[PDB]
Amino acid sequence: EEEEFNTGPLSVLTQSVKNNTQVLINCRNNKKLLGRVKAFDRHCNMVLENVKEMWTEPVNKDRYISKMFLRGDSVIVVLRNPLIA
Template structure:
């Protein structure tokens, strides 16, 4: 039985420490996302990224594929003119590396087919 499947109450102190290090290095959420090859929404500094996580490390550095990048731009108005409304924009990136220091939030919803 692996340490992931063994209940914590049945582990020795050494096994608990080993499991803690393993969970710290991988993290259960990102591990499931990579394993299931599902899409996630990642909030960054001033944009949102919707894509598939292919790899990650404990610093939340990620390799993403099929990324839809979304952001909002406010057009500049000339003096004395009325203000323009913000415009939502998007773009597509086939593969990218995302530095963990710019990740604010990772959202993932497991979709089920049960009704």
């Protein structure tokens, strides 16, 4: 199982936790959560730090959330990048 977290597509999350790097999460709510992965699981539940939530309403909006838990079903996409840099 660890092997599948380590080398499979979830290695994106595994890599973000290890390097304390930022990732953008496109989300079902049409919102995007930008931050660092403290923890994750099979379902893509996550505990996130320094989250910048961004969305639109046209008007763009954002808000800072230091500490939060995301239920993984809401995940559409998870992006790793030269974002942290």
